[PDB]
């Protein structure tokens, strides 16, 4: 039911993806998304010490030099507080998910957004998730590159039939 999405390295894509490439990071968690989006005052303000505990997750914000904690706080506020109720189980979940992503190619990895590279003739995956979704920037009949791993389809498993 919850969508897990993450960023993948790509020097050709300015922002988080280029920063990950330079830092030798292959996969960095974006968020864990239940159906219910949080509205209003969070039940708890996510501190930098708390958010830093999700080891290896990079901020999408250039203002923190892609470290912590603008993306992390935004994720707790928009998707965390109203569904997890307390910060401790959400940090342990976000951190276990990132620790799993750092290991390499996940069991379920589907492209979300691409940057088509004319030189290598590949759909360089900039964001992926654990379930298939309509693509953005991915060119039809071109193979996908998930932080170096070549896959002919949009997922590292079969969807169709
Ligand atoms: C998918 O995403 C959902 C969120 O939409 C996740 O579900 C949440 O899981 C967390 C645990 O990881 C749950 O948090 C705990 O809630 C306890 C109270 O919950 C009551 O019962 C139902 C649950 O069916 C709730 O819906 C009600 O609102 C009730 O409040 C709460 O007591 C508990 O805290 C205790 O432990 C922590 C430490 O773990 C202490 O810090 C704390 O003081 C206290 O002792 C937790 O906060 C949460 O209830 C779940 N939310 C829902 C809506 O079900 C799934 O886990 C996600 N799954 C995957 C695979 O990603
Ligand atoms: C990771 O991705 C980045 C971005 O795509 C890439 O960086 C680019 O690298 C190229 C080559 O080193 C570089 O090109 C040079 O640009 C200067 C002018 O630069 C100015 O303008 C840029 C915008 O156009 C701006 O980004 C710069 O900061 C700067 O203000 C130009 O003078 C160079 O001279 C030419 O050199 C070529 C050969 O290299 C000759 O054929 C030619 O005649 C000129 O002498 C050259 O074009 C580009 O500026 C970089 N862009 C950015 C954004 O940094 C990295 O290369 C890539 N990393 C890896 C490891 O792949
Ligand atoms: O985790 C993230 C967050 C944002 N982005 C993209 O970077 C820009 C936001 O500054 C935006 O270009 C935004 O595009 P979007 O995510 O909305 O598709 C990422 O790539 N990864
Ligand atoms: O199920 C979903 C799918 C996407 N999103 C948000 O929309 C942005 C673009 O897809 C995604 O980058 C994400 O942005 P965010 O909420 O993390 O700011 C969801 O919220 N839930
Ligand atoms: C991490 O991976 C292991 C093995 O696939 C799995 O048992 C565990 O549930 C995963 N944790 C998360 C947070 O996805
Ligand atoms: C977060 O995950 C890392 C593994 O990358 C682990 O070493 C660390 O103890 C975990 N942190 C918390 C707060 O559990
Ligand atoms: C990134 O991915 C490539 C391809 O899977 C791999 O060769 C490389 O070792 C990975 N880097 C890290 C930091 O795990």
UniProtKB/Swiss-Prot annotation:
Inhibited by Zn(2+), which binds the catalytic site. The active site is at 74 (for e(rns) glycoprotein rnase activity), 75 (for e(rns) glycoprotein rnase activity), 78 (for e(rns) glycoprotein rnase activity), 79 (for e(rns) glycoprotein rnase activity). It catalyses: a ribonucleotidyl-ribonucleotide-RNA + H2O = a 3'-end 3'-phospho-ribonucleotide-RNA + a 5'-end dephospho-ribonucleoside-RNA + H(+); a ribonucleotidyl-ribonucleotide-RNA = a 3'-end 2',3'-cyclophospho-ribonucleotide-RNA + a 5'-end dephospho-ribonucleoside-RNA; a 3'-end 2',3'-cyclophospho-ribonucleotide-RNA + H2O = a 3'-end 3'-phospho-ribonucleotide-RNA + H(+). It is a peripheral membrane protein. Disulfide bonds join 38-82, 68-69, 110-155, 114-138. Glycans are attached at residues 2, 11, 26, 65, 95, 100, 143. The record marks 30 as: Hydrogen donor to release the cleavage products of E(rns) glycoprotein RNase activity. It is found in: Host membrane; Virion membrane. Heavily glycosylated. Homodimer; disulfide-linked. Initial binding to target cell probably involves interaction of E(rns) with glycosaminoglycans. Also possesses intrinsic ribonuclease (RNase) activity that can inhibit the production of type I interferon and assist in the development of persistent infections. This is E(rns) glycoprotein. It comes from Bovine viral diarrhea virus (strain CP7) (BVDV). The lineage of its organism: Viruses, Riboviria, Orthornavirae, Kitrinoviricota, Flasuviricetes.
């Amino acid at each position: 039911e919850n969508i897990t999405q993450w960023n993948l390295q790509d020097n050709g894509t300015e922002g988080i993806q280029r920063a990950m490439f330079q830092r030798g990071v292959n996969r960095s968690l974006h968020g864990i998304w239940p159906e219910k989006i949080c509205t209003g005052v969070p039940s708890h303000l996510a501190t930098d010490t708390e958010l830093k505990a999700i080891h290896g997750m990079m901020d999408a914000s250039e203002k923190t030099n892609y470290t912590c904690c603008r993306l992390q706080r935004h994720e707790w506020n928009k998707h965390g507080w109203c569904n997890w109720y307390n910060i401790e189980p959400w940090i342990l979940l976000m951190n276990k998910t990132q620790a799993n992503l750092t290991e390499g190619q996940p069991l379920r990895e589907c492209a979300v957004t691409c940057r088509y590279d004319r030189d290598s003739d590949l759909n360089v995956v900039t964001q992926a998730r654990d379930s298939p979704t309509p693509l953005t920037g991915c060119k039809k009949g071109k193979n996908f590159s998930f932080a170096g791993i070549l896959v002919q389809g949009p997922c590292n498993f079969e969807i169709a039939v």
